[PDB]
Design a protein around this ligand. Structure first.
Ligand SMILES: Nc1nc2c(ncn2[C@@H]2O[C@H](COP(=O)(O)OP(=O)(O)O)[C@@H](O)[C@H]2O)c(=O)[nH]1
Ligand SMILES: *CCC(=O)Nc1cc(C)nc(C)c1Br
Ligand SMILES: [Mg+2]
Length: 167
């Protein structure tokens, strides 16, 4: 089957691990070791193609040396949390990092606004839409707690990779 190398990036605490674990195990984690970085595998049918997703759940090596495992990534989920203004403001840094590791301004990428189930919103959907439009990428809101938008964010990334290269 076809392998898709996905990388999940973003500020600590936005829900990178919870989004990955919800996608793979259909379960929401109340806590997950903030320092653990690992790649997880998931076989799934997307638009009739049997795909092997190899997802790197980053812990933030550069912020806390270069992460050698990110360089082979074909697509990136850039995650902020809708109740964490700082994580949204940090999106510029992660996008610059992705451009640097791939030496390109045309990288398959999806801006993800996680924790959409929470009522303490500080990042408006229009702020995230403006940011995603300047980068030329899709913006999707998710909840790793309720699974709302989770499959869509990962499948949209797979579709963005296909849009960029033959798979
Ligand atoms: N309510 C809610 N909490 C979430 C969601 N995603 C993550 N969290 C919580 O936010 C905290 C940090 O999540 P985690 O996945 O470890 O973040 P990471 O550092 O980006 O990997 C944990 O307590 C999670 O349960 C979500 O969509 N909704
Ligand atoms: C949420 C990410 C995080 O806490 N990462 C982290 C923290 C510390 C203290 N050290 C390292 C090496 C890392 Br990746
Ligand atoms: Mg994590």
């Amino acid at each position: 089957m076809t392998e898709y190398k996905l990388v999940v990036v973003g500020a600590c605490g936005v829900g990178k691990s919870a989004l990955t674990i919800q996608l793979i195990q259909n379960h929401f984690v109340d806590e997950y070791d903030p320092t653990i970085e690992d790649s997880y595998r998931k076989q799934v049918v997307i638009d009739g193609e049997t795909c092997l997703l190899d997802i790197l759940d980053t812990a933030g090596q550069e912020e806390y040396m270069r992460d050698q495992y990110m360089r082979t990534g074909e697509g990136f989920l850039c995650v902020f949390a809708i109740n964490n203004t700082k994580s949204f403001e940090d999106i510029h840094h992660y996008r610059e990092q992705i451009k640097r590791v791939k030496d390109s301004e045309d990288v398959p990428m999806v801006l993800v606004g996680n924790k959409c189930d929470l009522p303490s919103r500080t990042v408006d959907t229009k702020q995230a839409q403006d940011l995603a439009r300047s980068y030329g990428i899709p913006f999707i809101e998710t909840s790793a707690k309720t699974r709302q938008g989770v499959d869509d964010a990962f499948y949209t990334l797979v579709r963005e990779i296909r849009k960029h290269k033959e798979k």
